């Protein structure tokens, strides 16, 4: 009711909650899809290598965990009478992990595809792929860190 707490305030929080999962899922799916094409193409000649070079799929999958963790955290913080400021912070947290996770997914997809194909020809290259994927992976972690910091302030020192 009060000007600081309009009845439409939860909208921004609710969109932020969904945003965390929408974009992370797209990042994880793209990373899984294009990595899978690389794995399936190489294993015809080198089937013994499959469980070693599957790693990129794990890396892509973890991006979805980030989205789930942030989405649940804001979800347990939504409320019928929450302040408008709380809504904006939750929206920022959702976008932060969401679109940053999408960026990580595209990186993992491209690097994983090329890395897996190359690793079938040159065993020395595998550790190279893992290092480059770690740098791609960390782009998701940075987004999560910002999202968690934002969410921690979503209700601190707030007044209705």
């Amino acid at each position: 009711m009060t000007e600081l707490c309009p009845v439409y305030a939860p909208f921004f929080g609710a969109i932020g909650c969904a945003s965390a999962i929408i974009f992370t899922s797209l990042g994880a799916a793209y990373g899984t899809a294009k990595s899978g094409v690389g794995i399936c193409a190489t294993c015809v000649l080198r089937p013994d290598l499959l469980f070693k070079n599957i790693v990129p799929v794990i890396m892509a999958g973890i991006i979805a965990i980030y989205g789930l963790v942030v989405s649940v955290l804001v979800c347990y913080s939504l409320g019928q009478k929450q302040a408008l400021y709380t809504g904006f912070i939750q929206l920022g947290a959702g976008l932060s992990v969401g679109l940053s996770g999408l960026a990580a997914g595209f990186a993992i997809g491209i690097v994983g595809d090329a890395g897996v194909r190359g690793s079938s020809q040159q065993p020395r290259l595998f550790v190279g792929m893992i290092l480059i994927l770690i740098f791609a992976e960390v782009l998701g972690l940075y987004g999560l860190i910002v999202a968690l910091l934002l969410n921690s302030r979503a209700t601190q020192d707030v007044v209705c």
Binding site: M1, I21, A28, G36, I58, L68, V72, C75, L78
Partner: protein
């Protein structure tokens, strides 16, 4: 009248319900269509492998069930005789978006992996256990969407 329950609130509740089911079908439709091309592609070359490789199609079908469950739960809460609050309206809108786009994203990955998976499985019979393992990681993307959708629905009405 209760200011937290304006008469336009049900609009967003139904919008979430529609988003839940429509997008889930889109995810399921892509997954089966892409997989079907792969299954049919090997048909003329190795007829034996089909019945033991419809896994992508079956898993792609589960995505529709995720959508159905959330859509049913939302439709069970909306009523003309209850003071359905605007807060509940937004929460059910997010329920639809979460499960909807999660299933759409999962369906796309299942289709892409399923196609090349079976389509090259004919060249290398040891490949199959790998295909199933990748599909599972592609599958759970949809499951995460349902989990949050159920939590949102639980809090919205309370």
């Amino acid at each position: 009248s209760n200011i937290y329950a304006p008469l336009y609130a049900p609009f967003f509740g139904f919008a979430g319900c529609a988003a839940a089911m429509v997008l889930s079908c889109l995810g399921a439709a892509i997954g089966t269509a892409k997989s079907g091309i792969g299954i049919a592609g090997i048909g003329t070359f190795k007829p034996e492998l089909i019945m033991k490789s419809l896994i992508p199609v079956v898993m792609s079908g589960i995505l529709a069930i995720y959508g159905l469950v959330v859509a049913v739960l939302i439709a069970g809460n909306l009523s003309p005789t209850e003071d359905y609050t605007l807060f509940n309206g937004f929460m059910h809108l997010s329920c639809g978006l979460c499960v909807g786009f999660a299933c759409l994203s999962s369906g796309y990955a299942i289709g892409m992996v399923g196609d090349v998976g079976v389509r090259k499985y004919m060249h290398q019979p040891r490949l199959f256990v790998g295909i199933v393992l990748i599909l599972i990681f592609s599958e759970v993307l949809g499951l995460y969407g349902m989990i949050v959708a159920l939590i949102l629905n639980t809090r919205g009405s309370e």
